[PDB]
């Protein structure tokens, strides 16, 4: 079996060879699912027979079967890939948009800062733009966390506190709309990890992102986060009223709750990191990279289908008429844009339109789906002049 | 090729019932419209019980495409009768929900049992069941709603119909002076007012029952008169909503809005069976392609469309933990008939007169919610790890 | 009584002499209570101190009331030339769009302002185009509601229609109040449940005829026509109505929108109309035929909705500033009422922005700048401003 | 002239006679008005009998002659206050047999007051007085406090500077100019306070605001609990939401502290009256800014005129459009269960039980007021010339 792979790439082959076609594939070399055969080729170290070869990639052999058998969702992933490098150039043309000015931090970032990547649910990566440059998540991270609380505590009890659907500051039952606006992320937030102080609770969602990004970058913006307290009437006013509705499970510090919120709201990523997370979204809650389970398929459908009417503030619903993806924005200019079965992904410029989602991005996004047929409701059979990712 | 079947079903001879068997195991039946030669053939041939290379061969020769993908289990749902089974468990544990109310608002509605229930089940292929009551005509009230639309948008496209009407749902008019939605009696009034301008309400009529002819695949679709004639005299709401329409301008230029009422009433007093109907949602479910005549019906755009409303919109006031829990597109009407598709995979008719105080049938609802429960066929359910629930597409 | 009065005015007294200082009165000589008196001088230049009791005596006591100035408004003569300069200077505002819904409305000359005023006691004056018929409109919804009450009584009216401002249906599934259009095709429904339409169109007639002191009423059949040939939206309220069961039972919906835009299409002048108001002040009494033709009770929240409802979308603003109970319509007729002192009746076409007559709320804020009318100044100290009562 | 007076009420006049005959026109010998004449009587009264001659009531009444004049000579608002006085009497007795409603337990102090507690307190124009039940007992004024608090905004700051940060209207926190709908709503009272006494601290402006208070009562009782203030900052969220909210809109004026401001709002709804020092302000705004009983000019006629105003829509929470169509009166409520009413032009009042009903107003004092207007014509709407079975406590 791994003569069989050996024989597919001839007497002896050159590691750059071997190493070539596997980043074809979409796979990278720095794979933590890979790590076992790159060890062994680091020891080894130009040209492999039969025996050396079979002796690196043994513990890896199945992911590398899939690779090279084209097995990968998408098969063809350096095609896809020049597609995604013209949606992205497409978008880079539009300099419209504002970037947000409400605190420093968010105004300080540069307008043409725009960047885009990709990865599959094979865990497939690309990326174009600057996905390297580290941006708070701000609300696209009350996707996360709710994930994060339908996982630990369960659906019925999470959505006692906060509703299901889109409203058009509470509902008839006198709960927050969804776990997608700010009075119901506040809720949410009050349920992650009751009994501890913030500290914990900050270390175990920051944990749990780290897993949810196959231990790629997540990180803290003390910056972000005091400028965000400074500027909290806002959300000062909704936690007051939360509280005096009795919104908040019983125990509950009001004032301390909300300085966790603007915590996880000052959390940091990268395009590259956070496609990752969207990643484990689409994967059904294992994480691609690295394969783990980290959220439970109950948390990642909740999660979904409110992120699919909910997610785009109030270009929703027009999103999820045109798009039909499950998405998350932030008014750092992130998009978590989610492909069931898929792929995930992190579009992000700092820009914003009048209704608080990134110009790019959102510019993006739609080309994406006009050129593929990733449309929840496209039909897989027949997709008219759409293309086909998968095949 | 047509030999490589005749293999898979031993000894030289096949006794012709066998094949049949087989044939039906498969949910395919064999009064199907792409079968029709094949079985033309079968009982000519039958006529001058055993079958040979030769003859299973002229006799399977000009539908084999078809055949061989039913017996290589390359069907969406490989194993039916398993698949099969676990709808009547689902249909039957739906049953023991006696609770609920009949619409009596007319006659008509009021007249039918509180114990007729039904489901039937169309996939993508052409696999059929069904079980409980699915030979009684019923309207379609609004489940009519999304088929009008995809009818619209197909021929007038996206851009023009959404002019008059709303893509969202709702908390009469939106910021915009348009109705929320074509799932919504103001937003499938206007709708309404869109199709084939410039005719009599015969010819428009006429036009809209081919098109349901198509979708439905030339099973039943039928129209009663009596439910009309009801419909008219109870009509205050819609005609309140008609002036309000016509007062802020919502219709196409020349539109005589009273005329459009008529129109409307009609295509809600349009008739179907659970069977007939199952077909109907398969077509939408197939992207557009009537499952057992293999033929286009509406366009990718009309069909896709249609599906992301009756996802957000469908279910009256429910639509909101519809799309939650159920995460299914469909729609309901207020003869207790559930319109019901599964994307890529199947489309139903959960039909029984009871309603519950959203206005949608109980035994539907319930059913709707085990069949999501049991399966993965829920939108966001992950076709690689869906936990404990069963994928029937293996 | 009748010699006192004759002495206030020789041993011999000309009637233009008597007809002048009567006129000074604020008092018409064609006012109905002083028809006996008018008819003897006629039946009769100079007369002495019989001729004239002969004559007076059997008014004596209005007169006599008139000239001892015991009238709401002592000096009318005063007054009087305040009002032409708050006229004067609503003149002078031309904004304002001339409804053109229909052609009725359009047809109005921009430049027609006029202003009556009728007090309590019957004191008239008038500026402006005041003999220019004009549809009530939206001005009729009060008095068809008083009517309603007057009839049925508060508590029965207001099983179907509800008491206060909204901001179709309240919480109670009735109309928000008599002075919108929901309301008022409710009210109109409840009078008069008995007779054909055209019986309960004649009843309400000679009702506004009572109220305008037998003056000027009078109904176009052009408007009539053109308002139900565009009903749709009060068909649609109509229909609604009728959906959430909001009429008294046995009623014809239908029917009752035709009398509905009947009573809007009925014709009066600035005159006549503020005779009407003034009944409204008076207390149901129409001020210069002396005659009662609604009970306190149906004047009382008629008043009171005229104050919250009354201006449309600007009612809330004209109750905080103007302070005075008053109707508008899209003629361009604001119904004016100052309790206890007069009525109004201002006529311009240009509407403003909310509906209302430009020059009309020009004229309504100037007044109650000028006098302490509003609601709720005070008699005591009101400061800076004119009371015509003294 | 003081001599008229004199004989109208023998050769020689008792005092005490006098004092009964002055005390059934509703005046009161504390009057501050009577003080020079009722120092006299008590001075007099030493030198000397207990009788009274002409020249000695001469140089009694000398200087309050003019107030006493009208007094004796029926001039009064309400000419007989005593038939007036039995009317109040009946509908105080018929209104307290109403034992529906429940004392609000939102915070301690509310919920000591017992249910029994039910008074009502007059004060005419002229300085007329009549107290029955318990009228001499303090509560919180809490939002009885808005309209008085608005009044001094508009008094000094005028009604254009004002409503820039406030509404005019009624509702149905914030209205489509982005303001509060009135003053009569929490979220309309804490900007109306922000208004006030701008550029100095909590401290000043709560002493002018008393200040203000006690010439509207003539200098009766305005007091402060402290037990109630300390409990409504504890139970504040739903202000501190609101206020929050007003902060983040812009509401307030430039340099306005948020968080001071609510605090202060506090206080001002801890301030204590009772049913007959409270009576005196409303006549105060019955009487166009003059206190009836110190003839001192408090407030503009302005200022008197916009409250009343609001208080006739916006003045009884939900119960607001009813009570202006029923009732007619400008009024305004608290969750102390006292009822600020008056009666332009003619009187003031304060009526006072714990208990409140589904809408936040106290049973027996919506009770009354019904009453109140059924029985005479005081309702806004109502004639003056022409009315059916009431009856005119104006008219002789
Ligand atoms: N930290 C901000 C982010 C707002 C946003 O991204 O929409 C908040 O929670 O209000
Ligand atoms: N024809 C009925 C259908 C009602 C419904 O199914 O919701 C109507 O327009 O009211
Ligand atoms: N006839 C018009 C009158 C509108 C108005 O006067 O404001 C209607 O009923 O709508
Ligand atoms: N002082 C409390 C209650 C006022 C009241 O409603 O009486 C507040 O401002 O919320």
Redesign the interface.
């Known amino acids: 079996l791994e003569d069989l792979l050996f024989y597919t790439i001839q007497e002896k082959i050159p590691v750059h060879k071997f190493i070539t076609a596997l980043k074809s594939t979409g796979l990278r070399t720095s794979d933590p699912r890979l790590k076992e055969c790159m060890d062994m080729l680091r020891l080894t170290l130009v040209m492999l027979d039969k025996d050396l070869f079979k002796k690196c990639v043994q513990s890896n052999i199945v992911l590398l079967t899939q690779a090279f058998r084209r097995k990968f969702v998408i098969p063809d992933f350096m095609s896809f890939t020049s597609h995604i490098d013209e949606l992205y150039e497409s978008a880079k043309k539009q300099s419209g948009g504002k970037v947000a000015d409400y605190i420093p931090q968010l105004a300080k970032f540069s307008p043409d800062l725009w960047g885009v990547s990709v990865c599959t ?1 094979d865990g497939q990566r690309h990326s174009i733009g600057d996905t390297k440059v580290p941006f708070c998540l701000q609300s696209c991270v009350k996707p996360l966390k709710y994930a994060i609380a339908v996982n630990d505590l369960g659906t019925e009890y999470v959505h006692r506190y906060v509703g ?5 500051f509470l509902n008839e039952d006198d709960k927050p709309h969804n776990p997608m606006v700010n009075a119901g992320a506040i809720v949410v937030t009050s349920l992650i990890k009751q009994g501890v102080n913030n500290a914990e609770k900050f270390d175990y969602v920051m944990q749990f992102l780290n897993k949810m990004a196959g231990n790629e970058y997540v990180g803290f913006s003390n910056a972000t986060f005091q400028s965000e307290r400074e500027s909290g ?2 959300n ?6 939360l ?2 509705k009795k919104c908040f499970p019983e125990g509950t510090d009001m004032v301390g709750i909300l300085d966790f919120y603007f915590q996880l709201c000052s959390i940091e990523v990268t395009c590259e990191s956070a496609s990752v997370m969207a990643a484990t979204l689409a ?4 994480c691609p990279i690295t394969g783990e ?1 980290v959220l ?3 948390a ?3 999660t ?3 992120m ?2 909910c997610g785009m503030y109030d270009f929703s ?2 999103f ?2 045109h798009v ?1 993806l ?1 998405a998350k924005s932030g008014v750092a200019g992130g998009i978590l844009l989610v492909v ?2 898929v792929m995930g992904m992190m579009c992000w410029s700092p820009p914003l339109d009048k209704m608080g989602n990134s110009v790019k991005g959102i510019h993006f996004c739609h080309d994406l789906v006009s050129l593929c047929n990733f ?10 002049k759409k293309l086909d990712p998968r095949r």
């Open positions: 649910v299901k659907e889109p409203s058009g009437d806002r000062f006013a909704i936690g007051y009223y509280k005096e994967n059904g809650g294992f389970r439970s398929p109950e990642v459908r909740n979904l289908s409110l699919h009417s619903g027009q999820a008429f039909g499950p069931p079965n449309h929840n409701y496209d039909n897989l059979r027949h997709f008219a």
